[PDB]
């Protein structure tokens, strides 16, 4: 998984969902009076509306990512082994399941500060949605038009980090991912000088030499590095359309194609979908592995859904 | 630039055109009776028809790449400094400009062996199209449904290489590109074993560790390595549509986004367009930097042209 933010003519937040299968993902709009029920907390009958991507099971929206009517966004990304969900209730905390976490935050919080304060009161509990949808280890990126934070709940506590670059992937833990960038300081967008030695006449026979050292594989750390370099150096656009175009290009730099990442199961990890939320006008844009064309949907008590097209939509002249 | 072939349910050939500018390009169909004129050879009035991508100037099709009605493809890729165009005519060769080369081959040859034989009779001459369109150093991939060859005309001769992997980028010369792959033999699509040492308990906290070592930058050698690994390991598709989809994903692994590669002109090198020719049914599919949606066109004495749309075509729900 790779989640990023981007600030340009509007403000954006989005992710690649990388898995070795698809759950039949769909757009899900949760309106303000859809009642949210919680395994260990009282129901929330009136809340902020949400638009995002996920599945609906037993009339419950299981979001992978979403935004709310205020332009606050949240995404859950795989974090295996390090994620720690409590086997006991904590009487001094709100006891919330990982599948409830996106509703709990986005239904009640208008911005990153409010999200942080509510995360400071949580205990994530080890209760699965159903037998057929068991919990996976996750961490989260939470973003608004100004800033983002990372939430990592591990055996040592509920950790909240300011995210100075608007990038998240998978393991390792966030301070490790940030520290790991330090060794890439010498990368450049332009051809470097010969600092190796002026005693040998080194020659440049193509463009792009500045980036040599950048990692190309699809491990989560390499994707973290490559997405950071790609995003931070990406050219500014003059319009919102150009920004959304650039955003998909950025996510494309760390896309997983089928065949290059074979999991222990024998199945191929791939980028099931990519998306970009325009936080200021509350619009979701997405693509799927099977369909290159971008789809847009802009943000009652019933869930409203729209299933993703998994056919390549080609303009035939 | 990156050019590749793929063999699946049909047989495919295509490329990323990477440049730091674009004044537009277009689909160009050259029908069988468009008269090809040559600076130093007789005109060819009846030939094979072509479909490809390029620009038209003074009613001449200046192809970046094309296929003919027999499913033979050719692409010109930047090869600066190494390309050598003769200042003199050679009386024992056919004297063909570089901008005439695609017509010369694809107009007359049905398959790779014929192309090879006609290349063995050529002398590429240093004559520009016009004073406003100067010659660039290029090298070529030529491909049919069975195999491909690389043509590199340098100061030491007209060199023709069998291309065992169907991949070409820019400098260095082709034997250097192929030799360079050898140091990546231990890359893998799967998590490797700990061969570092059994005396330390090294842990794997994510998928994709097999690829670590793969280069991620947009230098031509790195792109050559990364396109090769991505193509050769790409999962097979069950239909032609799934193959085309996969082909665009492969070219995506080596796409240049605006901002990461600043050239000597101060401009940003980027993937202007991407394409995939189905050689068996003679259809051209393409995308552009500005428009993700795939456009398809299938293959008289006048050129027929279709200008590339440079707007993002979004499916709005």
Automatic annotation (TrEMBL), chains A, B:
Q: Which organism was this protein described from?
A: Ligilactobacillus salivarius
What catalytic activity does the UniProt entry give for this protein?
taurodeoxycholate + H2O = deoxycholate + taurine; cholate + taurine = taurocholate + H2O
Enzyme's top EC category: hydrolase
Question: What are the record keywords, sorted?
Answer: Hydrolase, Lipid metabolism, Plasmid
Q: What is this protein called?
A: choloylglycine hydrolase
On whether Hydrolase is a keyword of this UniProt record, the answer is: yes
| Gene3D superfamilies noted in UniProt | Penicillin V Acylase, Chain A (3.60.60.10)
**Listed EC numbers:** 3.5.1.24
Choloylglycine hydrolase/NAAA C-terminal domain sequence ranges: 1-302
Kindly tell me the pathway this chain contributes to. Answer: Lipid metabolism; bile acid biosynthesis
Regarding protein family, the annotation reads: Belongs to the peptidase C59 family.
Matches recorded under InterPro entries: CBAH, CBAH/NAAA_C, Ntn_hydrolases_N, Peptidase_C59
In Gene Ontology terms, what is a biological process of this protein?
lipid metabolic process
Q: What domain of life does the native source organism fall in?
A: Bacteria
Q: Which GO terms describe its molecular function?
A: choloylglycine hydrolase activity
């Amino acid at each position: 998984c790779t989640a990023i933010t981007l600030n340009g003519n509007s403000n954006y937040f989005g992710r690649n969902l990388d898995l070795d299968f698809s759950y039949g993902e769909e757009v899900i709009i949760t309106p303000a009076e859809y009642e949210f029920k919680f395994r260990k907390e009282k129901a929330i009958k009136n809340h902020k509306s949400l638009i995002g991507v996920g599945i609906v099971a037993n009339d419950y929206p299981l979001y992978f990512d979403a935004i709310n009517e205020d332009g606050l966004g949240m995404a859950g990304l795989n974090f295996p082994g390090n994620a720690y969900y409590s086997d006991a209730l904590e009487n001094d905390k709100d006891n919330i399941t990982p599948f409830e976490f996106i509703p709990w935050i986005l239904g009640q919080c208008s911005d990153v500060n409010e999200a942080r304060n509510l995360v400071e009161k949580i205990n994530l509990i080890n209760l699965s949605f159903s037998e057929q949808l068991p919990l996976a280890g996750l961490h989260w990126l939470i973003a608004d038009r100004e800033k983002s934070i990372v939430v990592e709940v591990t055996k040592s506590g509920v950790h909240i980090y300011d995210n100075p670059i608007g990038i998240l992937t998978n393991n390792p833990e966030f301070n490790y991912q940030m520290y790991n960038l330090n060794k890439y300081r010498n990368l450049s967008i332009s051809t470097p000088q010969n600092t190796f030695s002026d005693s040998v006449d080194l020659k440049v026979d193509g463009t792009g030499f500045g980036g040599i050292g950048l990692p190309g594989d699809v491990s989560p750390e390499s994707r973290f590095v490559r997405a950071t370099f790609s995003k931070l150096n990406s050219s500014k656009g003059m319009t919102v359309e150009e920004d959304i175009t650039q955003f998909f290009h950025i996510l494309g730099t760390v896309e997983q194609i089928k065949g290059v990442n074979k999991t222990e199961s024998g199945k191929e990890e791939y980028t099931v979908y990519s998306n970009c939320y325009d936080l200021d006008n509350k619009t979701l844009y997405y693509t799927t592995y099977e369909n290159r064309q971008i789809v847009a949907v802009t943000l009652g008590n019933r869930l409203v859904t729209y299933p993703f097209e998994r056919k390549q939509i080609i303009n035939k002249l």
